[PDB]
Design a protein around this ligand. Structure first.
Ligand SMILES: *[C@@H]1O[C@H](CO)[C@@H](O[C@@H]2O[C@H](CO)[C@@H](O[C@@H]3O[C@H](CO[C@H]4O[C@H](CO)[C@@H](O)[C@H](O)[C@@H]4O)[C@@H](O)[C@H](O[C@H]4O[C@H](CO)[C@@H](O)[C@H](O)[C@@H]4O)[C@@H]3O)[C@H](O)[C@H]2NC(C)=O)[C@H](O)[C@H]1NC(C)=O
Ligand SMILES: *[C@@H]1O[C@H](CO)[C@@H](O[C@@H]2O[C@H](CO)[C@@H](O[C@@H]3O[C@H](CO[C@H]4O[C@H](CO)[C@@H](O)[C@H](O)[C@@H]4O)[C@@H](O)[C@H](O[C@H]4O[C@H](CO)[C@@H](O)[C@H](O)[C@@H]4O)[C@@H]3O)[C@H](O)[C@H]2NC(C)=O)[C@H](O)[C@H]1NC(C)=O
Ligand SMILES: *[C@@H]1O[C@H](CO)[C@@H](O[C@@H]2O[C@H](CO)[C@@H](O[C@@H]3O[C@H](CO[C@H]4O[C@H](CO)[C@@H](O)[C@H](O)[C@@H]4O)[C@@H](O)[C@H](O[C@H]4O[C@H](CO)[C@@H](O)[C@H](O)[C@@H]4O)[C@@H]3O)[C@H](O)[C@H]2NC(C)=O)[C@H](O)[C@H]1NC(C)=O
Ligand SMILES: *[C@@H]1O[C@H](CO)[C@@H](O[C@@H]2O[C@H](CO)[C@@H](O)[C@H](O)[C@H]2NC(C)=O)[C@H](O)[C@H]1NC(C)=O
Ligand SMILES: *[C@@H]1O[C@H](CO)[C@@H](O[C@@H]2O[C@H](CO)[C@@H](O)[C@H](O)[C@H]2NC(C)=O)[C@H](O)[C@H]1NC(C)=O
Ligand SMILES: *[C@@H]1O[C@H](CO)[C@@H](O[C@@H]2O[C@H](CO)[C@@H](O)[C@H](O)[C@H]2NC(C)=O)[C@H](O)[C@H]1NC(C)=O
Ligand SMILES: *[C@@H]1O[C@H](CO)[C@@H](O)[C@H](O)[C@H]1NC(C)=O
Lengths: 145, 442, 145, 442, 145, 442
C-alpha cells in the first residue's frame, strides 16, 4: 500500500504495514540529508545563512528526539525489539468496552486512537510498572538457581 | 478477558506545525531553494480517509510569509546603500514631449553625490517619478524615505522573478493533499493523498488581483473565513483566466556612478521618445464574462434576487488602493477603477487601466526599511494571468439586497493562502495500543 | 519517591525507581522542547538570536549523545532490553571486598559508585569481551544443528 | 562467589557545568527568558543525602555573568549610534537657580549635529552632567568617550528593569538546592532537595551595597572565600532589610532630534525648577542597628575583644569608589562615606548620601564600548532594599585588633554569587554495576 | 588489532573485532566532545563563531543519524541486541556463487562488500518482510494458548 | 544450503567528504584550532590493505582552502576600516639617500585624515610604496583600492604566522595515510595506516616556490594530474632543502594616529638609513644542484635525450608573475628570473633576487575586499626553506625535445595539495551480510 497507505484500512489489515511506517522516520531523515549533501550550492547556503541553517538543525534534532522517545518507551516496557508486543497488563472496559471483533475488523487506527486518546497516559504508566516488577522477578529466580 | 498489546509503526496522525523546507526544479529563489525536487513526484492515495482541512488556519501560509521576508532581506543585504544620496535635491519639471496625464509626473533633479574619494562630489542629473520625491519648504526636495528609513539599492543582477517553489515535509511529517474539486477551504475532505512535497507555488506578490496562480478545476469558487463578517476578505478563484498586458512605454538610458569604493549606483538618467503613461490592458469582453461568473457564485451565498455591485477602493495608501505588481523588476501601482465600476442585477475593445511607477518601495510594510528599485534600460512589457480576486464585502445592514464588493485586499498572506489551501501538515505518531487475546509469557 | 528521591536510599531499595530515572532523560528533553515550541516569542528568539539558538542546540545534541552512549554500552554487553541485567563476569574482591549484605542494605548508590569508581573502565572492558564470545558460541551452536 | 550485575536508572551524580536555560513568569529579560516557569514549582526532598556545595566555584554564577552581558549587547544592538555627536562642543556653565554643591555640575553645551539630510546640520542646545564632558584645550569640550569608543544610545522604550529570572537545568541535569539556614557558602549541606528551576533571582547590578536580594533566614551571615586573605571580598547577607530612598529632584524637559534617516536622538534639553543634587536617604537608626548586627557576626571570625572600624573606599575610579545603581533607567553614583564612617568597640534623623548622575556609561567594564543613557522626563524616585554589603577587610599585620572594613566590592559577579549560593549543577549518570548472586544463563 | 586493524584480515578473523568497530562511533563522538568541552577558549569559539559552530553541530547530528539508521535496521530485522545475527532468509547463488570456505577464509570484508554491493537493497528488503511475518506468527501462537 | 547472517561492527569503507575539524599543539591559528592534539599520536597499521589515493581529487584540500579563507575574514573583521583614508593624496618623490633601483619606488604623500572629532582633520605625512598608490590625472594620487573595494587595516597585534595544523576526522570517519615513499599522488598504495589526525601542516601561502613544507623521503618527486596537458601544474617536492634568506633592509619609524573613536591607524612614517631594495638570497651552488635533481626526474617523464630549459613567467599580474611571500607580516613579491634562467642538456656566490613590497593586498583574489598590512618597525629578516616548486610545462608540439618549464603556479590550493597527498577521508559503514550455515530458530 506504501507509507500510510493503510491509514484508512482496518486495524487488523494495518498490521502488515508496520514496517513501512516504523522505518520511515530514520530512512526519511537520512535520504533528505543525502540529497542536501549533494551540495548544489546547499552546503554553502546551509552554512552561510546561519538563520536558515539553524532552522534545519532544529528540525533534525527534533526528529531524532521523537524517534528516541518512542524507542525508550518501548525499552522500558520490554518491547524494544519488536513491532508487535504483548504485555502483562489486562485491558480495562473503562478505556473501551467495544467488542474485539469490532476493533480489529470494523475500525481504523485513526478512529481507535481518538476513541481511547484520554487513556494513553495511564496505560503507559501501567506498562512501565509491570515491566519493572517482571525484571526483578527474573533476577531473583536466577539468584535462587 | 483481553490483554494490552503494543504496536509500533501504527498509521496515526496529529495536526502539527513544522519548519518545512523548500525545494525547487542569479535568481534568489533558485539560490535559496537549492534542494532538488523529486525527479518523479509520487502521491499515495489514501482510501477511506476523511480529514478536516482549514485554509484559514493553515500554518503553511504563515511559514511562507516568514521565509519570503527573510529571503528578501538576505538578498538585499550585500548591496549598496544609498544613504549618501539623501541630500537636498534641486528639481524642475520634465517638459520634453509630455503627453497629458504625465504632466508633472516626472521631475528632473540634480544633486551632489559622493564619489570614489571622500574629497570629491559629482553633480548628477536624473529623472525621478513624483511618488519618490517630496518637497521640503526650481524648489528643494528630498527622497520620500529620508525622514523614516535607510534606503538600500537592490543589486541589479539579482533576479526576484518567482519560480515554482515546493514545500516539503521534514522526516517525521507528511503533507496531506485535498483533491476535492468542490472544496471551499474549510471542513472535511474525502479524497486525500499523502505527498512529501507540495505542488509548486509561485511566490507572486500583488494586492488586488491574484496573478499567476492555480485555476479552479470546474467552477469559480468563493472562499472566505465567514460570509457575514465584512471585516473578512473573500478569495475568489477563477476556473478560466483573464490575460492582462502591462507595459511601461517609455524608453530609458540607465546610467551608473560610483557612489563609493566599488559601490555602484544606478539612476534613470534620461528618457527616449515621448513621456507616456504606463498602462495595463484587460480585454473588456473577457473581463465582463469573468465578472459575471463571479457574480453568479456570489449569489449562491447572498441570494439570487439580489443586486450585486462592484465599486473601487474606499481610500488609503497607494499600496492598498491600487493593484501592486512587480513587472521585470519594476514596481507598478495600477488603478483598477475601470474594472470594478459596474452593477449586476437579477475591434478588441480593451479596458485600459492607468498605472503609476514607484522606485522607492516600503516593501513588506516594514516602516524601518526601504528599497530602491534600480531602473531598467529600455521598454518594459509583461503578460500575466489573473487567476483570482480579493474582494471585500462593503457590508451595511440595509436589507436593500444591493450587496457591494470592492477590490480591497492589500494583505500579503492571501496570495498564498489561496494556493496552499489544499495542503495540511500532519505529524506521524506511530505508537499505540489495542486489546488482543495474547498475554506475554511471564 | 520521585526523580532521584531514592538517591539517599539503599542500593536495594533504589532498584524500584530504576524506571523513574531511566526514562527521565528523554521525557525531560521532549517536555522541555514542547514548552519551548509554544512559541511565546521563543521560536522567534531561538532562531533570531543565533548565538542563543546554537547554545540550545548544543545542549540538546549533547544530551542525546549521552543517552546513546549508555544505550550502546548496554547493547554491546547484551543488556539493552532491560534495566537489570546479569552477566557472565565474576565479581573481583580486588574491586571491592565488602559483604553482599552490606552492599545491598547499609549503603547507597552514591557511596558505592565512589567506592568502586577506579574499576569502571576495567569492568566495562570485561563485559564487552565476554559478550562477544557468547554470541560467537551461539552462532556455532546453530551451525551444528 | 558473586557475579557482576548491570543496572540502568541508577541515581548517581557527578559535578558538572552546563548551559542552563532561562525561564520567567518591552522588557529585555522578558523577551529573552521567553520560556515559561513551572505553574506549580516542585522539589523532591532527598532523605539521607549529604553533598558539598562551593559558592566560590559555582559555575552558575559564571554562566549568569555571560548571558547578562550578551543580553545587554543584543538589546543595544538595533539602536541609534551617536557617533555623529562626537563633535566639538561649545560649553558654558548652567547658572539658573543653582543650589550649592551643584555649582559647576551641569554645563550648557551647544553643537552642530546631523539631520535627515546630509547637507544640513542643526544647532542644538542641551544640558550635560560634568562627568560626561571633558575639556579639549566659553571653552571647547568633547564627550568623555570620544577618544576610546563608539557611543550607542540605548533604545528609549526598552526596559532593563530586573524581573525574576529562573535558571533551569536542561534534561540530563538536575539542580541541587541547599536548605541549610546556617550555610556559609562552603562545605557539606545535609538538607538538600532536587529542583528543575532555581528560585527566581533578580539580575540587579550594583557595586557596594547589594540591592533587592534574598534575606538570610535567621541571622546575618558573613560569607567569604577566606577570612585571612585581605584580597578577598566578604559578602554580607542581612536577615532584616534596610530601606533606601533614591531621588533625582530635578524636573526635565526631554526633547528629540532626528540624527538621521529614522534615527532619533534624545537629549536632556532644559531643567525645570531649581538645580539640585540627587540624594539617597537611609534611616540612621536602622542603619546603625544593621551595622551593629554585621559587627557582631564579624567578631565571630576576628575575636570578640576587638575593635571594628568602618571606613570609605581607598580610591580609584567612580565606578568602584561609589555605589552604582540603576534607578528608572538613570545611572546613579552614590557617595557612601556617610554610611561607613564609624568605630565599634567591645524627627526621623536620616542619613543623606549625595549622588552623582552620569549619562555615558562604560557598562560591564569593556573599554571598547559605551552606552548613552537617554534622560528621563520628569522627577525620578526609586525605593529599594539593601539586602547585603560587599566589604573588604583592609588587612595589615598590626595585631592591634582594630580590624578595618571598607565598602569596596566593585565586582559584578558577587551580586549573584550571594543569591545562587544555594544551588549546584549535577549531571546524572544512571549506569553502574554491583555484585549479586545471579549469573546469566549461557 | 585495534580499530580497523582487521580491515585486511579475513572475514572470519574479523568477527572477533566486531565490538571494536561497533562501539567506535559513539565513544568517538563522546570523547571528541569531552576534549572540546575542556574549553581552552573552545566554548567561546564554538559559540561566538556561529559559522564554525554550526559546522560542528552539523557533523554531530549527522553522525548520530547514521548510528540510528543502522540500529533501526537491525531493530526491524530482529537483530538489534547482537553483533552477530542469523535470520530466516536463504542465501541466493545469484548474489554470490562463491564457496563458503572461500568467503570465510580467503577473502576480507572490503573485498566481499564490493562483490555483493548491488544486492544490498534487496537483501535488506527480504529481511524486513521475513521479520514482520515471524512476529505475527508469534502473536497468533500466544492467542491460541 | 546457506543462510543470510547479519554482522554489525564490520570493518568496511566508503569514500567520503566531511567537515574535518582542526586541532593544534594572539595567533589566529591558535585561537581557531583550540582543540588539543593527541598527547600521544597513534596509528594503526593495516596489514593486507590496498587502497587508491587521488591527490588531485582530495577533498581535504578543498576544505583547507575554505577554512583558511574564513579564518582570515573573521580575523580581520573586528578591525579598523581605513575608508576615511581614501582621499586625494598630495605626493612627491622620496629623494633622501636613495640607492639606484629604488628611485621612484617610494613616494612621500600627505593627506587630511579624520580624527577623534568629526569637526577636525589632521594633516599626515607618510611614505608609501609605489605599488599602493596610483595617479589620478607634486601630483594628485589615490590608493590603488579606492575605485574597487573597501580597505581594512589588519589588527597590529594579531599574528598570522603559520603554526602546525592538524586535521582530524569527526567520529564515524577515519583518515587513511599512505606511507609509500615512492607515491606520485595517484593510484594504489599498499602501506596504509589509520589515523585520527593528520601530520601537522603549516598553512603557508606562496605563489612560485613552496616554502616550509615536508620533504620527500628518498628522491625528488614530480607529481602532476597529467604529463601531456600543459594546462596543468607540476608540483615538485624536493628531498633536500634550499635555504632562502629574505630581508627588507630599510629601518622604519612606525607612527599611529587615531582615525576615529578608539580606532587607530598605523602608517610607515619615515625611514632610517639609506633607502634600499628588499632582497631574497639563494645560494647558487645549492640551487644549481637542486635544479639538476629536478631535471633528472623530469627526464624520466619526457625522455633522457632531451633538453630541459627553464624560463621566467610569461606575464600577468604581480601576484602571479612573482613569488609572493609573507615575512613577519610584511608582503613580499620576489623576482625569480634569476633562479629560472638556465638550460640543461644531455666566497659563497649567492643569487640575489630583487623584491618588491606591497601594503595593500587583494588577498585570496577576492575583487571586493582588500587588506592593509600595517608596517613593521625596524628591519625585517626571515629565513625559510624551499621545499618545492610549482612548474608549468610551456608546451608546444615542436618535437624539438626542448621542453621548457616556467615558475608559473599562482594557485593557492597547490600549496596544500602537495602536503595532504598522503591522506584520504573514509566513512566507516559497519553493517553488512554474508552467508553461513546458521538459521535462526523460528
Ligand atoms: C506571470 O508569468 C509571466 C510569464 O513568466 C511573467 O512574465 C514574464 O516575466 C519574465 C521576467 O520579466 C520575462 O522574462 C524576461 O524576458 C525578457 C524579454 O526577453 C524576451 O526574449 C527572450 C528570448 O529568448 C525570451 O526568452 C523571453 O521570454 C522574452 O520573450 C528578458 O530580457 C529577461 O531577461 C532579463 O531578466 C532575467 C530575469 O531573471 C535575467 O535573468 C536576464 O539576465 C535578463 O536581465 C527575462 O528573460 C518573461 O518574458 C515574461 N513572459 C512573458 C509573458 O512575456 C509575469 O511577470 C508573471 N506575473 C507577474 C505577477 O510577474
Ligand atoms: C528594587 O525594587 C523596587 C521595586 O520594584 C524598584 O523600584 C521600582 O522601580 C520600577 C522601575 O523604575 C518602578 O516602576 C516604574 O514606576 C513608575 C512610576 O509609576 C507609579 O505609578 C504606577 C501606577 O500604576 C505604579 O504602577 C508604579 O509602581 C509607580 O508607583 C512608572 O512611571 C514606570 O513606568 C515606566 O517604566 C516602565 C519600565 O518597565 C515602562 O514599562 C513604562 O512604559 C514606563 O515607561 C514604572 O512602572 C517602580 O514603581 C519602583 N517601585 C517603587 C518602590 O516605587 C527598585 O528600583 C529596585 N532596586 C533597584 C536596584 O533598581
Ligand atoms: C618558515 O619558517 C621560519 C621559521 O619559523 C619562518 O621564519 C620565522 O618567522 C617568525 C615570524 O616572523 C619569526 O618569529 C619572530 O622573530 C622575531 C625576531 O626575534 C628574534 O629573537 C627572539 C628571541 O627569543 C627569537 O625567539 C626569534 O626567533 C628571533 O630570533 C620576533 O621579534 C617576532 O616577535 C614578534 O612577532 C610575533 C609573531 O607571532 C609576536 O607574537 C610577537 O609579539 C612579536 O610581535 C617573532 O618571534 C622567526 O624568528 C623566524 N625564524 C627565523 C628563521 O628567523 C619563516 O617565515 C617561514 N616561512 C614563511 C613562508 O614565512
Ligand atoms: C476501503 O473500504 C472498502 C470497503 O468500503 C474496502 O473494500 C474491501 O476490499 C477487500 C479486498 O479487495 C474485499 O474482500 C472486501 O469485500 C471489500 N469490502 C466491501 C464492502 O466490498 C477497501 O479494502 C478499503 N481500503 C483499504 C486501503 O483498506
Ligand atoms: C533514610 O534513613 C532512615 C534511617 O536513618 C530510613 O528509615 C527506615 O524506614 C523504613 C520504612 O519506613 C523502616 O522500616 C526502618 O525501620 C527505618 N530505619 C530506622 C533505623 O528506623 C529511611 O527510609 C531512609 N530514606 C530513604 C528515602 O531511603
Ligand atoms: C596478512 O596476510 C598474511 C598472509 O599473507 C597473514 O599471515 C598469517 O598469519 C597467521 C597467524 O600468525 C599464520 O598462522 C599464517 O600461517 C600466516 N599466513 C601465511 C601464508 O603464512 C596475516 O595474518 C594477515 N594480517 C591480518 C591482520 O589479517
Ligand atoms: C510642475 O508643474 C506643476 C503645475 O502643473 C507645479 O504644481 C509643480 O510644482 C511643478 N514642479 C516643479 C519641480 O517645478
Amino acid at each position: 500500500l506504501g507509507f500510510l497507505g493503510a491509514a484508512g484500512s482496518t486495524m487488523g489489515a494495518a498490521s502488515m504495514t508496520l514496517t513501512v511506517q516504523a522505518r520511515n522516520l530514520l530512512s526519511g531523515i537520512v535520504q533528505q540529508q543525502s540529497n542536501l549533501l549533494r551540495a548544489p550550492e546547499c552546503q554553502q547556503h546551509l552554512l552561510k545563512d546561519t538563520h536558515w541553517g539553524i532552522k534545519q538543525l532544529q528540525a533534525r534534532v527534533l526528529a531524532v528526539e521523537h524517534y528516541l522517545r518512542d524507542q525508550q518507551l518501548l525499552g522500558i516496557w520490554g518491547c524494544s525489539g519488536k513491532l508487535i508486543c504483548c504485555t502483562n497488563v489486562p485491558w480495562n472496559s473503562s478505556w473501551s468496552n467495544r467488542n474485539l471483533s469490532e476493533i480489529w475488523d470494523n475500525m481504523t487506527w485513526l478512529q481507535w486512537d481518538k476513541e481511547i486518546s484520554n487513556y494513553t497516559q495511564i496505560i503507559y504508566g501501567l506498562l512501565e510498572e509491570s515491566q519493572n516488577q517482571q525484571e526483578k522477578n527474573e533476577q531473583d529466580l536466577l539468584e535462587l538457581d | 478477558n483481553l490483554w494490552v498489546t503494543v504496536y509500533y509503526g501504527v498509521p496515526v496522525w496529529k495536526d502539527a506545525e513544522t519548519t518545512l523546507f523548500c525545494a525547487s526544479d542569479h535568481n534568489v529563489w533558485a539560490t535559496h531553494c537549492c534542494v532538488p525536487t523529486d525527479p518523479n513526484p509520487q502521491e499515495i492515495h489514501l482510501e477511506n480517509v476523511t480529514e478536516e482541512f482549514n485554509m484559514w488556519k493553515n500554518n503553511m501560509v504563515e511559514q511562507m510569509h516568514t521565509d519570503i521576508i527573510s529571503l528578501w532581506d538576505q538578498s538585499l543585504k550585500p548591496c549598496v546603500k544609498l544613504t549618501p544620496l539623501c541630500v537636498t535635491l534641486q528639481c524642475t519639471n520634465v517638459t520634453n514631449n509630455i503627453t497629458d496625464d504625465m504632466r508633472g509626473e516626472l521631475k528632473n533633479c540634480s544633486f551632489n553625490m559622493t564619489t570614489e574619494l571622500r574629497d570629491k562630489k559629482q553633480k548628477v542629473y536624473s529623472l525621478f517619478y513624483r511618488l519618490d520625491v517630496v518637497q521640503i519648504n526650481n524648489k528643494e526636495y528630498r527622497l520620500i524615505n529620508c525622514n523614516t528609513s535607510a534606503i538600500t539599492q537592490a543589486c541589479p543582477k539579482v533576479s526576484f522573478e518567482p519560480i515554482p517553489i515546493h514545500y516539503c515535509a521534514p522526516a517525521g511529517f507528511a503533507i496531506l493533499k485535498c483533491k476535492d474539486k468542490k472544496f471551499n477551504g474549510t471542513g472535511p475532505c474525502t479524497n486525500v493523498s499523502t505527498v512529501q512535497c507540495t505542488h509548486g507555488i509561485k511566490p507572486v506578490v500583488s494586492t488586488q488581483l491574484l496573478l499567476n496562480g492555480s485555476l479552479a478545476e470546474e467552477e469559480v469558487i468563493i472562499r472566505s473565513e465567514n460570509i457575514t463578517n465584512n471585516a473578512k476578505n473573500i478569495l475568489v478563484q477563477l476556473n478560466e483566466s483573464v490575460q492582462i498586458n502591462c507595459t511601461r512605454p517609455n524608453n530609458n538610458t540607465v546610467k551608473s556612478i560610483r557612489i563609493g569604493p566599488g559601490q555602484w549606483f544606478y539612476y534613470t538618467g534620461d528618457i527616449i521618445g515621448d513621456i507616456r503613461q504606463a498602462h495595463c490592458n484587460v480585454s473588456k469582453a473577457t473581463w465582463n464574462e469573468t465578472l459575471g461568473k463571479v457574480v453568479k457564485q456570489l449569489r449562491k451565498h447572498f441570494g439570487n434576487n439580489t443586486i450585486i455591485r462592484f465599486a473601487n477602493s474606499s481610500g488609503g495608501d497607494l499600496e492598498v488602493t491600487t493593484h501592486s505588481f512587480n513587472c521585470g523588476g519594476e514596481f507598478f501601482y495600477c488603478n483598477t477603477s475601470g474594472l470594478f465600476n459596474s452593477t449586476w442585477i437579477s475591434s478588441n475593445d480593451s479596458i485600459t487601466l492607468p498605472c503609476r511607477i514607484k522606485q522607492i518601495i516600503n516593501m513588506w510594510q516594514r516602516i524601518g526599511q526601504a528599497m530602491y528599485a534600480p531602473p531598467i534600460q529600455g521598454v518594459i512589457r509583461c503578460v500575466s494571468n489573473i487567476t483570482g480576486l480579493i474582494l471585500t464585502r462593503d457590508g451595511g445592514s440595509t436589507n436593500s439586497t444591493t450587496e457591494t464588493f470592492r477590490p480591497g485586499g492589500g494583505d500579503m498572506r492571501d496570495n498564498w493562502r489561496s494556493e496552499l489551501y489544499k495542503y495540511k501538515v500532519v505529524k506521524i505518531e506511530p505508537l499505540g495500543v489495542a486489546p488482543t487475546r495474547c498475554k506475554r509469557r511471564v
